[PDB]
Amino acid sequence: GSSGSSGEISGFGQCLVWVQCSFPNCGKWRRLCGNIDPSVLPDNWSCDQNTDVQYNRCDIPEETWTGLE
Amino acid sequence: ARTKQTARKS
Ligand SMILES: [Zn+2]
């Protein structure tokens, strides 16, 4: 890395994608699979449209993503 | 629906 170029891709340099719930009483951010792109996702995406069953509901709290716990 | 990206870091 460490240089001015578009499309940062390298070994161990993995990206991640996140999506915010469409409900204002949610506003929760769920993780997605690295094969998915935010330019092919719906304008009304919600927790019910998640890929991971551990967080596929609006009644499930947001994940601890702060480090390793 | 808002979207973002982050680095896999701590
Ligand atoms: Zn939700």
PDB file of N, CA, C and O and ligand atoms in Angstrom:
ATOM      1  N   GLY A   1       0.838  -1.219   0.000  1.00  0.00           N
ATOM      2  CA  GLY A   1       0.000   0.000   0.000  1.00  0.00           C
ATOM      3  C   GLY A   1       0.861   1.252   0.000  1.00  0.00           C
ATOM      4  O   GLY A   1       1.867   1.306  -0.708  1.00  0.00           O
ATOM      5  N   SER A   2       0.481   2.268   0.782  1.00  0.00           N
ATOM      6  CA  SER A   2       1.304   3.468   1.069  1.00  0.00           C
ATOM      7  C   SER A   2       1.577   4.352  -0.172  1.00  0.00           C
ATOM      8  O   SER A   2       2.615   5.011  -0.269  1.00  0.00           O
ATOM      9  N   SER A   3       0.658   4.373  -1.143  1.00  0.00           N
ATOM     10  CA  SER A   3       0.803   5.084  -2.424  1.00  0.00           C
ATOM     11  C   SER A   3      -0.560   5.526  -2.993  1.00  0.00           C
ATOM     12  O   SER A   3      -1.595   4.905  -2.722  1.00  0.00           O
ATOM     13  N   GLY A   4      -0.572   6.620  -3.767  1.00  0.00           N
ATOM     14  CA  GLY A   4      -1.782   7.254  -4.303  1.00  0.00           C
ATOM     15  C   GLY A   4      -2.278   6.575  -5.579  1.00  0.00           C
ATOM     16  O   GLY A   4      -1.939   7.000  -6.683  1.00  0.00           O
ATOM     17  N   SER A   5      -3.123   5.560  -5.420  1.00  0.00           N
ATOM     18  CA  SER A   5      -3.727   4.773  -6.508  1.00  0.00           C
ATOM     19  C   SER A   5      -5.139   4.293  -6.125  1.00  0.00           C
ATOM     20  O   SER A   5      -5.395   3.930  -4.973  1.00  0.00           O
ATOM     21  N   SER A   6      -6.069   4.272  -7.081  1.00  0.00           N
ATOM     22  CA  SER A   6      -7.430   3.740  -6.897  1.00  0.00           C
ATOM     23  C   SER A   6      -7.469   2.198  -6.965  1.00  0.00           C
ATOM     24  O   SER A   6      -6.671   1.565  -7.667  1.00  0.00           O
ATOM     25  N   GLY A   7      -8.401   1.578  -6.224  1.00  0.00           N
ATOM     26  CA  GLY A   7      -8.570   0.119  -6.166  1.00  0.00           C
ATOM     27  C   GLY A   7      -7.496  -0.553  -5.306  1.00  0.00           C
ATOM     28  O   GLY A   7      -6.656  -1.291  -5.824  1.00  0.00           O
ATOM     29  N   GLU A   8      -7.521  -0.296  -3.996  1.00  0.00           N
ATOM     30  CA  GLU A   8      -6.571  -0.863  -3.031  1.00  0.00           C
ATOM     31  C   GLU A   8      -6.889  -2.345  -2.757  1.00  0.00           C
ATOM     32  O   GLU A   8      -7.828  -2.672  -2.028  1.00  0.00           O
ATOM     33  N   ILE A   9      -6.095  -3.247  -3.343  1.00  0.00           N
ATOM     34  CA  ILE A   9      -6.225  -4.712  -3.242  1.00  0.00           C
ATOM     35  C   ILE A   9      -4.828  -5.325  -3.063  1.00  0.00           C
ATOM     36  O   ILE A   9      -3.931  -5.077  -3.872  1.00  0.00           O
ATOM     37  N   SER A  10      -4.632  -6.126  -2.017  1.00  0.00           N
ATOM     38  CA  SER A  10      -3.358  -6.781  -1.676  1.00  0.00           C
ATOM     39  C   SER A  10      -3.569  -7.898  -0.632  1.00  0.00           C
ATOM     40  O   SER A  10      -4.637  -7.990  -0.014  1.00  0.00           O
ATOM     41  N   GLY A  11      -2.553  -8.744  -0.407  1.00  0.00           N
ATOM     42  CA  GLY A  11      -2.589  -9.830   0.581  1.00  0.00           C
ATOM     43  C   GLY A  11      -2.733  -9.292   2.007  1.00  0.00           C
ATOM     44  O   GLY A  11      -2.032  -8.351   2.387  1.00  0.00           O
ATOM     45  N   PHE A  12      -3.677  -9.865   2.767  1.00  0.00           N
ATOM     46  CA  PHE A  12      -4.129  -9.451   4.111  1.00  0.00           C
ATOM     47  C   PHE A  12      -4.930  -8.126   4.132  1.00  0.00           C
ATOM     48  O   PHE A  12      -5.635  -7.845   5.105  1.00  0.00           O
ATOM     49  N   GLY A  13      -4.898  -7.334   3.051  1.00  0.00           N
ATOM     50  CA  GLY A  13      -5.594  -6.048   2.902  1.00  0.00           C
ATOM     51  C   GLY A  13      -7.039  -6.224   2.437  1.00  0.00           C
ATOM     52  O   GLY A  13      -7.407  -5.745   1.363  1.00  0.00           O
ATOM     53  N   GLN A  14      -7.847  -6.930   3.230  1.00  0.00           N
ATOM     54  CA  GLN A  14      -9.250  -7.215   2.922  1.00  0.00           C
ATOM     55  C   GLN A  14     -10.165  -6.038   3.299  1.00  0.00           C
ATOM     56  O   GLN A  14     -10.095  -5.504   4.411  1.00  0.00           O
ATOM     57  N   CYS A  15     -11.067  -5.682   2.381  1.00  0.00           N
ATOM     58  CA  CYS A  15     -12.161  -4.734   2.610  1.00  0.00           C
ATOM     59  C   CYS A  15     -13.385  -5.421   3.254  1.00  0.00           C
ATOM     60  O   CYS A  15     -13.472  -6.651   3.331  1.00  0.00           O
ATOM     61  N   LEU A  16     -14.364  -4.610   3.662  1.00  0.00           N
ATOM     62  CA  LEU A  16     -15.644  -5.029   4.246  1.00  0.00           C
ATOM     63  C   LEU A  16     -16.755  -4.082   3.761  1.00  0.00           C
ATOM     64  O   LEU A  16     -16.471  -2.940   3.402  1.00  0.00           O
ATOM     65  N   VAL A  17     -18.005  -4.548   3.726  1.00  0.00           N
ATOM     66  CA  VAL A  17     -19.192  -3.766   3.328  1.00  0.00           C
ATOM     67  C   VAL A  17     -20.221  -3.820   4.456  1.00  0.00           C
ATOM     68  O   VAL A  17     -20.451  -4.878   5.045  1.00  0.00           O
ATOM     69  N   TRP A  18     -20.845  -2.672   4.725  1.00  0.00           N
ATOM     70  CA  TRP A  18     -21.888  -2.498   5.732  1.00  0.00           C
ATOM     71  C   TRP A  18     -23.113  -1.784   5.142  1.00  0.00           C
ATOM     72  O   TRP A  18     -22.984  -0.900   4.291  1.00  0.00           O
ATOM     73  N   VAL A  19     -24.292  -2.138   5.653  1.00  0.00           N
ATOM     74  CA  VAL A  19     -25.605  -1.616   5.223  1.00  0.00           C
ATOM     75  C   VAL A  19     -26.416  -1.154   6.426  1.00  0.00           C
ATOM     76  O   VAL A  19     -26.540  -1.897   7.398  1.00  0.00           O
ATOM     77  N   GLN A  20     -26.964   0.062   6.355  1.00  0.00           N
ATOM     78  CA  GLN A  20     -27.816   0.619   7.403  1.00  0.00           C
ATOM     79  C   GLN A  20     -29.291   0.285   7.148  1.00  0.00           C
ATOM     80  O   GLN A  20     -29.804   0.504   6.047  1.00  0.00           O
ATOM     81  N   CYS A  21     -29.968  -0.197   8.194  1.00  0.00           N
ATOM     82  CA  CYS A  21     -31.399  -0.474   8.220  1.00  0.00           C
ATOM     83  C   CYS A  21     -32.251   0.747   7.808  1.00  0.00           C
ATOM     84  O   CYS A  21     -32.011   1.879   8.243  1.00  0.00           O
ATOM     85  N   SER A  22     -33.259   0.520   6.968  1.00  0.00           N
ATOM     86  CA  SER A  22     -34.165   1.557   6.450  1.00  0.00           C
ATOM     87  C   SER A  22     -35.064   2.200   7.521  1.00  0.00           C
ATOM     88  O   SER A  22     -35.513   3.337   7.335  1.00  0.00           O
ATOM     89  N   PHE A  23     -35.312   1.520   8.650  1.00  0.00           N
ATOM     90  CA  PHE A  23     -36.110   2.062   9.746  1.00  0.00           C
ATOM     91  C   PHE A  23     -35.309   3.046  10.616  1.00  0.00           C
ATOM     92  O   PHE A  23     -34.186   2.732  11.026  1.00  0.00           O
ATOM     93  N   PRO A  24     -35.898   4.208  10.962  1.00  0.00           N
ATOM     94  CA  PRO A  24     -35.265   5.235  11.786  1.00  0.00           C
ATOM     95  C   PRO A  24     -35.129   4.803  13.251  1.00  0.00           C
ATOM     96  O   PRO A  24     -34.166   5.173  13.918  1.00  0.00           O
ATOM     97  N   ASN A  25     -36.060   3.973  13.734  1.00  0.00           N
ATOM     98  CA  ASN A  25     -36.016   3.344  15.060  1.00  0.00           C
ATOM     99  C   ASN A  25     -34.989   2.192  15.173  1.00  0.00           C
ATOM    100  O   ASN A  25     -34.736   1.698  16.277  1.00  0.00           O
ATOM    101  N   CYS A  26     -34.375   1.797  14.050  1.00  0.00           N
ATOM    102  CA  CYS A  26     -33.274   0.837  13.972  1.00  0.00           C
ATOM    103  C   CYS A  26     -31.961   1.604  13.766  1.00  0.00           C
ATOM    104  O   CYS A  26     -31.200   1.812  14.716  1.00  0.00           O
ATOM    105  N   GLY A  27     -31.699   2.021  12.518  1.00  0.00           N
ATOM    106  CA  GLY A  27     -30.462   2.669  12.098  1.00  0.00           C
ATOM    107  C   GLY A  27     -29.230   1.772  12.241  1.00  0.00           C
ATOM    108  O   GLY A  27     -28.105   2.269  12.198  1.00  0.00           O
ATOM    109  N   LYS A  28     -29.431   0.463  12.430  1.00  0.00           N
ATOM    110  CA  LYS A  28     -28.372  -0.509  12.692  1.00  0.00           C
ATOM    111  C   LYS A  28     -27.558  -0.815  11.431  1.00  0.00           C
ATOM    112  O   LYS A  28     -28.116  -0.888  10.336  1.00  0.00           O
ATOM    113  N   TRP A  29     -26.253  -1.046  11.585  1.00  0.00           N
ATOM    114  CA  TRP A  29     -25.356  -1.407  10.488  1.00  0.00           C
ATOM    115  C   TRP A  29     -25.021  -2.899  10.566  1.00  0.00           C
ATOM    116  O   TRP A  29     -24.391  -3.335  11.524  1.00  0.00           O
ATOM    117  N   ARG A  30     -25.422  -3.684   9.560  1.00  0.00           N
ATOM    118  CA  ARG A  30     -25.087  -5.112   9.467  1.00  0.00           C
ATOM    119  C   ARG A  30     -23.963  -5.317   8.440  1.00  0.00           C
ATOM    120  O   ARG A  30     -23.913  -4.605   7.428  1.00  0.00           O
ATOM    121  N   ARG A  31     -23.068  -6.276   8.711  1.00  0.00           N
ATOM    122  CA  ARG A  31     -22.015  -6.725   7.785  1.00  0.00           C
ATOM    123  C   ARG A  31     -22.601  -7.525   6.615  1.00  0.00           C
ATOM    124  O   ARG A  31     -23.646  -8.160   6.758  1.00  0.00           O
ATOM    125  N   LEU A  32     -21.877  -7.552   5.496  1.00  0.00           N
ATOM    126  CA  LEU A  32     -22.188  -8.334   4.291  1.00  0.00           C
ATOM    127  C   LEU A  32     -20.968  -9.129   3.795  1.00  0.00           C
ATOM    128  O   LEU A  32     -19.829  -8.864   4.189  1.00  0.00           O
ATOM    129  N   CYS A  33     -21.219 -10.094   2.906  1.00  0.00           N
ATOM    130  CA  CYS A  33     -20.195 -10.931   2.271  1.00  0.00           C
ATOM    131  C   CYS A  33     -19.383 -10.126   1.238  1.00  0.00           C
ATOM    132  O   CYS A  33     -19.948  -9.314   0.499  1.00  0.00           O
ATOM    133  N   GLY A  34     -18.073 -10.382   1.132  1.00  0.00           N
ATOM    134  CA  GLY A  34     -17.138  -9.613   0.285  1.00  0.00           C
ATOM    135  C   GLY A  34     -17.376  -9.722  -1.229  1.00  0.00           C
ATOM    136  O   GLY A  34     -16.804  -8.943  -1.991  1.00  0.00           O
ATOM    137  N   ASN A  35     -18.232 -10.650  -1.668  1.00  0.00           N
ATOM    138  CA  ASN A  35     -18.693 -10.781  -3.057  1.00  0.00           C
ATOM    139  C   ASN A  35     -19.849  -9.810  -3.411  1.00  0.00           C
ATOM    140  O   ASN A  35     -20.167  -9.626  -4.587  1.00  0.00           O
ATOM    141  N   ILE A  36     -20.473  -9.169  -2.413  1.00  0.00           N
ATOM    142  CA  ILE A  36     -21.591  -8.222  -2.576  1.00  0.00           C
ATOM    143  C   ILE A  36     -21.046  -6.789  -2.682  1.00  0.00           C
ATOM    144  O   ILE A  36     -20.041  -6.449  -2.055  1.00  0.00           O
ATOM    145  N   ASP A  37     -21.713  -5.940  -3.470  1.00  0.00           N
ATOM    146  CA  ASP A  37     -21.328  -4.547  -3.715  1.00  0.00           C
ATOM    147  C   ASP A  37     -22.490  -3.587  -3.391  1.00  0.00           C
ATOM    148  O   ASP A  37     -23.627  -3.848  -3.809  1.00  0.00           O
ATOM    149  N   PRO A  38     -22.247  -2.469  -2.680  1.00  0.00           N
ATOM    150  CA  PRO A  38     -23.304  -1.544  -2.288  1.00  0.00           C
ATOM    151  C   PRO A  38     -24.000  -0.842  -3.466  1.00  0.00           C
ATOM    152  O   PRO A  38     -25.110  -0.346  -3.291  1.00  0.00           O
ATOM    153  N   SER A  39     -23.432  -0.859  -4.678  1.00  0.00           N
ATOM    154  CA  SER A  39     -24.093  -0.359  -5.890  1.00  0.00           C
ATOM    155  C   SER A  39     -25.119  -1.343  -6.495  1.00  0.00           C
ATOM    156  O   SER A  39     -25.808  -0.973  -7.448  1.00  0.00           O
ATOM    157  N   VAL A  40     -25.267  -2.563  -5.946  1.00  0.00           N
ATOM    158  CA  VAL A  40     -26.305  -3.546  -6.351  1.00  0.00           C
ATOM    159  C   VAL A  40     -27.279  -3.906  -5.208  1.00  0.00           C
ATOM    160  O   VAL A  40     -27.894  -4.974  -5.223  1.00  0.00           O
ATOM    161  N   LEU A  41     -27.439  -3.013  -4.219  1.00  0.00           N
ATOM    162  CA  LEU A  41     -28.342  -3.184  -3.068  1.00  0.00           C
ATOM    163  C   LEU A  41     -29.529  -2.195  -3.087  1.00  0.00           C
ATOM    164  O   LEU A  41     -29.409  -1.106  -3.663  1.00  0.00           O
ATOM    165  N   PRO A  42     -30.677  -2.575  -2.484  1.00  0.00           N
ATOM    166  CA  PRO A  42     -31.935  -1.836  -2.561  1.00  0.00           C
ATOM    167  C   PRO A  42     -31.929  -0.580  -1.683  1.00  0.00           C
ATOM    168  O   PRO A  42     -31.313  -0.549  -0.620  1.00  0.00           O
ATOM    169  N   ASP A  43     -32.674   0.445  -2.110  1.00  0.00           N
ATOM    170  CA  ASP A  43     -32.846   1.711  -1.375  1.00  0.00           C
ATOM    171  C   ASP A  43     -33.685   1.564  -0.087  1.00  0.00           C
ATOM    172  O   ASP A  43     -33.687   2.459   0.758  1.00  0.00           O
ATOM    173  N   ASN A  44     -34.352   0.420   0.085  1.00  0.00           N
ATOM    174  CA  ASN A  44     -35.200   0.069   1.231  1.00  0.00           C
ATOM    175  C   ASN A  44     -34.653  -1.157   1.997  1.00  0.00           C
ATOM    176  O   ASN A  44     -35.415  -1.890   2.634  1.00  0.00           O
ATOM    177  N   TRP A  45     -33.337  -1.401   1.925  1.00  0.00           N
ATOM    178  CA  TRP A  45     -32.648  -2.446   2.690  1.00  0.00           C
ATOM    179  C   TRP A  45     -32.919  -2.333   4.204  1.00  0.00           C
ATOM    180  O   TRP A  45     -32.863  -1.245   4.771  1.00  0.00           O
ATOM    181  N   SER A  46     -33.167  -3.454   4.872  1.00  0.00           N
ATOM    182  CA  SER A  46     -33.448  -3.548   6.312  1.00  0.00           C
ATOM    183  C   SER A  46     -32.799  -4.803   6.907  1.00  0.00           C
ATOM    184  O   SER A  46     -32.350  -5.674   6.160  1.00  0.00           O
ATOM    185  N   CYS A  47     -32.783  -4.934   8.240  1.00  0.00           N
ATOM    186  CA  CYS A  47     -32.252  -6.125   8.919  1.00  0.00           C
ATOM    187  C   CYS A  47     -32.837  -7.451   8.362  1.00  0.00           C
ATOM    188  O   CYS A  47     -32.142  -8.464   8.309  1.00  0.00           O
ATOM    189  N   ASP A  48     -34.093  -7.446   7.898  1.00  0.00           N
ATOM    190  CA  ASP A  48     -34.777  -8.594   7.278  1.00  0.00           C
ATOM    191  C   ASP A  48     -34.161  -9.033   5.928  1.00  0.00           C
ATOM    192  O   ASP A  48     -34.424 -10.137   5.448  1.00  0.00           O
ATOM    193  N   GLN A  49     -33.314  -8.190   5.332  1.00  0.00           N
ATOM    194  CA  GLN A  49     -32.619  -8.402   4.058  1.00  0.00           C
ATOM    195  C   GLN A  49     -31.126  -8.750   4.262  1.00  0.00           C
ATOM    196  O   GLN A  49     -30.343  -8.735   3.310  1.00  0.00           O
ATOM    197  N   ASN A  50     -30.717  -9.082   5.494  1.00  0.00           N
ATOM    198  CA  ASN A  50     -29.349  -9.490   5.831  1.00  0.00           C
ATOM    199  C   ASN A  50     -28.999 -10.914   5.358  1.00  0.00           C
ATOM    200  O   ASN A  50     -29.871 -11.779   5.231  1.00  0.00           O
ATOM    201  N   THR A  51     -27.699 -11.165   5.149  1.00  0.00           N
ATOM    202  CA  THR A  51     -27.146 -12.469   4.739  1.00  0.00           C
ATOM    203  C   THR A  51     -26.851 -13.396   5.914  1.00  0.00           C
ATOM    204  O   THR A  51     -26.708 -14.600   5.713  1.00  0.00           O
ATOM    205  N   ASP A  52     -26.788 -12.856   7.132  1.00  0.00           N
ATOM    206  CA  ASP A  52     -26.384 -13.568   8.346  1.00  0.00           C
ATOM    207  C   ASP A  52     -27.549 -13.681   9.342  1.00  0.00           C
ATOM    208  O   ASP A  52     -28.035 -12.677   9.866  1.00  0.00           O
ATOM    209  N   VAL A  53     -27.979 -14.917   9.616  1.00  0.00           N
ATOM    210  CA  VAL A  53     -29.167 -15.241  10.444  1.00  0.00           C
ATOM    211  C   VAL A  53     -29.028 -14.827  11.915  1.00  0.00           C
ATOM    212  O   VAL A  53     -30.018 -14.706  12.632  1.00  0.00           O
ATOM    213  N   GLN A  54     -27.790 -14.590  12.354  1.00  0.00           N
ATOM    214  CA  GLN A  54     -27.447 -14.094  13.685  1.00  0.00           C
ATOM    215  C   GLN A  54     -27.850 -12.629  13.902  1.00  0.00           C
ATOM    216  O   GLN A  54     -27.956 -12.207  15.052  1.00  0.00           O
ATOM    217  N   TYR A  55     -28.128 -11.878  12.829  1.00  0.00           N
ATOM    218  CA  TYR A  55     -28.533 -10.462  12.878  1.00  0.00           C
ATOM    219  C   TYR A  55     -29.591 -10.093  11.813  1.00  0.00           C
ATOM    220  O   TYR A  55     -29.709  -8.934  11.412  1.00  0.00           O
ATOM    221  N   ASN A  56     -30.379 -11.069  11.347  1.00  0.00           N
ATOM    222  CA  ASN A  56     -31.360 -10.903  10.262  1.00  0.00           C
ATOM    223  C   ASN A  56     -32.736 -10.346  10.705  1.00  0.00           C
ATOM    224  O   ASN A  56     -33.738 -10.528  10.009  1.00  0.00           O
ATOM    225  N   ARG A  57     -32.798  -9.697  11.875  1.00  0.00           N
ATOM    226  CA  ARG A  57     -34.011  -9.127  12.470  1.00  0.00           C
ATOM    227  C   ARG A  57     -33.736  -7.803  13.176  1.00  0.00           C
ATOM    228  O   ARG A  57     -32.773  -7.673  13.930  1.00  0.00           O
ATOM    229  N   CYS A  58     -34.670  -6.872  13.022  1.00  0.00           N
ATOM    230  CA  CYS A  58     -34.698  -5.564  13.675  1.00  0.00           C
ATOM    231  C   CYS A  58     -34.797  -5.597  15.214  1.00  0.00           C
ATOM    232  O   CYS A  58     -34.506  -4.603  15.883  1.00  0.00           O
ATOM    233  N   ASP A  59     -35.178  -6.743  15.774  1.00  0.00           N
ATOM    234  CA  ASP A  59     -35.315  -6.970  17.212  1.00  0.00           C
ATOM    235  C   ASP A  59     -34.011  -7.526  17.815  1.00  0.00           C
ATOM    236  O   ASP A  59     -33.921  -7.768  19.019  1.00  0.00           O
ATOM    237  N   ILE A  60     -32.982  -7.698  16.975  1.00  0.00           N
ATOM    238  CA  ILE A  60     -31.643  -8.134  17.365  1.00  0.00           C
ATOM    239  C   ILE A  60     -30.731  -6.903  17.474  1.00  0.00           C
ATOM    240  O   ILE A  60     -30.690  -6.099  16.532  1.00  0.00           O
ATOM    241  N   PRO A  61     -29.981  -6.768  18.582  1.00  0.00           N
ATOM    242  CA  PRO A  61     -29.080  -5.650  18.821  1.00  0.00           C
ATOM    243  C   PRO A  61     -27.928  -5.606  17.813  1.00  0.00           C
ATOM    244  O   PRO A  61     -27.624  -6.590  17.140  1.00  0.00           O
ATOM    245  N   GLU A  62     -27.278  -4.447  17.710  1.00  0.00           N
ATOM    246  CA  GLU A  62     -26.090  -4.246  16.882  1.00  0.00           C
ATOM    247  C   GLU A  62     -24.857  -4.957  17.496  1.00  0.00           C
ATOM    248  O   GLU A  62     -24.731  -5.087  18.718  1.00  0.00           O
ATOM    249  N   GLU A  63     -23.961  -5.455  16.643  1.00  0.00           N
ATOM    250  CA  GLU A  63     -22.782  -6.255  16.990  1.00  0.00           C
ATOM    251  C   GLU A  63     -21.663  -5.392  17.603  1.00  0.00           C
ATOM    252  O   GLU A  63     -21.475  -4.229  17.233  1.00  0.00           O
ATOM    253  N   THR A  64     -20.880  -5.982  18.518  1.00  0.00           N
ATOM    254  CA  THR A  64     -19.640  -5.389  19.042  1.00  0.00           C
ATOM    255  C   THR A  64     -18.532  -5.590  18.009  1.00  0.00           C
ATOM    256  O   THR A  64     -17.958  -6.675  17.904  1.00  0.00           O
ATOM    257  N   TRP A  65     -18.240  -4.541  17.236  1.00  0.00           N
ATOM    258  CA  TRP A  65     -17.235  -4.531  16.158  1.00  0.00           C
ATOM    259  C   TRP A  65     -15.964  -3.731  16.515  1.00  0.00           C
ATOM    260  O   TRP A  65     -15.115  -3.470  15.658  1.00  0.00           O
ATOM    261  N   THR A  66     -15.846  -3.340  17.789  1.00  0.00           N
ATOM    262  CA  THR A  66     -14.860  -2.399  18.354  1.00  0.00           C
ATOM    263  C   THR A  66     -13.420  -2.927  18.331  1.00  0.00           C
ATOM    264  O   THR A  66     -12.483  -2.136  18.417  1.00  0.00           O
ATOM    265  N   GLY A  67     -13.226  -4.240  18.179  1.00  0.00           N
ATOM    266  CA  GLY A  67     -11.921  -4.903  18.149  1.00  0.00           C
ATOM    267  C   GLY A  67     -12.051  -6.425  18.205  1.00  0.00           C
ATOM    268  O   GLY A  67     -12.602  -7.033  17.283  1.00  0.00           O
ATOM    269  N   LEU A  68     -11.555  -7.028  19.289  1.00  0.00           N
ATOM    270  CA  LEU A  68     -11.684  -8.454  19.601  1.00  0.00           C
ATOM    271  C   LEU A  68     -11.963  -8.625  21.104  1.00  0.00           C
ATOM    272  O   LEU A  68     -11.191  -8.159  21.947  1.00  0.00           O
ATOM    273  N   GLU A  69     -13.077  -9.285  21.433  1.00  0.00           N
ATOM    274  CA  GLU A  69     -13.658  -9.402  22.786  1.00  0.00           C
ATOM    275  C   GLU A  69     -14.079 -10.846  23.120  1.00  0.00           C
ATOM    276  O   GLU A  69     -14.760 -11.493  22.290  1.00  0.00           O
TER     277      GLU A  69
ATOM    278  N   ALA B   1     -31.459   3.735   2.001  1.00  0.00           N
ATOM    279  CA  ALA B   1     -30.562   2.797   2.720  1.00  0.00           C
ATOM    280  C   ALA B   1     -29.109   3.266   2.591  1.00  0.00           C
ATOM    281  O   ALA B   1     -28.554   3.229   1.490  1.00  0.00           O
ATOM    282  N   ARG B   2     -28.480   3.727   3.685  1.00  0.00           N
ATOM    283  CA  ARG B   2     -27.056   4.105   3.663  1.00  0.00           C
ATOM    284  C   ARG B   2     -26.148   2.875   3.574  1.00  0.00           C
ATOM    285  O   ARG B   2     -26.480   1.794   4.070  1.00  0.00           O
ATOM    286  N   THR B   3     -24.979   3.085   2.970  1.00  0.00           N
ATOM    287  CA  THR B   3     -23.909   2.103   2.759  1.00  0.00           C
ATOM    288  C   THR B   3     -22.562   2.739   3.065  1.00  0.00           C
ATOM    289  O   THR B   3     -22.355   3.935   2.850  1.00  0.00           O
ATOM    290  N   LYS B   4     -21.647   1.914   3.570  1.00  0.00           N
ATOM    291  CA  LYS B   4     -20.239   2.255   3.832  1.00  0.00           C
ATOM    292  C   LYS B   4     -19.325   1.033   3.666  1.00  0.00           C
ATOM    293  O   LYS B   4     -19.786  -0.096   3.492  1.00  0.00           O
ATOM    294  N   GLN B   5     -18.028   1.274   3.816  1.00  0.00           N
ATOM    295  CA  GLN B   5     -16.992   0.251   3.916  1.00  0.00           C
ATOM    296  C   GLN B   5     -16.029   0.608   5.054  1.00  0.00           C
ATOM    297  O   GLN B   5     -15.800   1.790   5.332  1.00  0.00           O
ATOM    298  N   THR B   6     -15.452  -0.417   5.695  1.00  0.00           N
ATOM    299  CA  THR B   6     -14.405  -0.282   6.720  1.00  0.00           C
ATOM    300  C   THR B   6     -13.259  -1.250   6.420  1.00  0.00           C
ATOM    301  O   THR B   6     -13.402  -2.169   5.610  1.00  0.00           O
ATOM    302  N   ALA B   7     -12.112  -1.048   7.068  1.00  0.00           N
ATOM    303  CA  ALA B   7     -10.997  -1.997   7.055  1.00  0.00           C
ATOM    304  C   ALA B   7     -11.166  -3.039   8.176  1.00  0.00           C
ATOM    305  O   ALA B   7     -11.595  -2.696   9.283  1.00  0.00           O
ATOM    306  N   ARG B   8     -10.797  -4.302   7.913  1.00  0.00           N
ATOM    307  CA  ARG B   8     -10.808  -5.378   8.917  1.00  0.00           C
ATOM    308  C   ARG B   8      -9.626  -5.209   9.889  1.00  0.00           C
ATOM    309  O   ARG B   8      -8.545  -5.767   9.683  1.00  0.00           O
ATOM    310  N   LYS B   9      -9.826  -4.399  10.934  1.00  0.00           N
ATOM    311  CA  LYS B   9      -8.804  -3.903  11.875  1.00  0.00           C
ATOM    312  C   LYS B   9      -9.346  -3.788  13.322  1.00  0.00           C
ATOM    313  O   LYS B   9     -10.561  -3.818  13.546  1.00  0.00           O
ATOM    314  N   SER B  10      -8.434  -3.612  14.291  1.00  0.00           N
ATOM    315  CA  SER B  10      -8.703  -3.385  15.730  1.00  0.00           C
ATOM    316  C   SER B  10      -7.900  -2.194  16.268  1.00  0.00           C
ATOM    317  O   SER B  10      -8.505  -1.314  16.920  1.00  0.00           O
TER     318      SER B  10
HETATM  319 ZN    ZN C   1     -33.449  -3.052  11.426  1.00  0.00          ZN
END
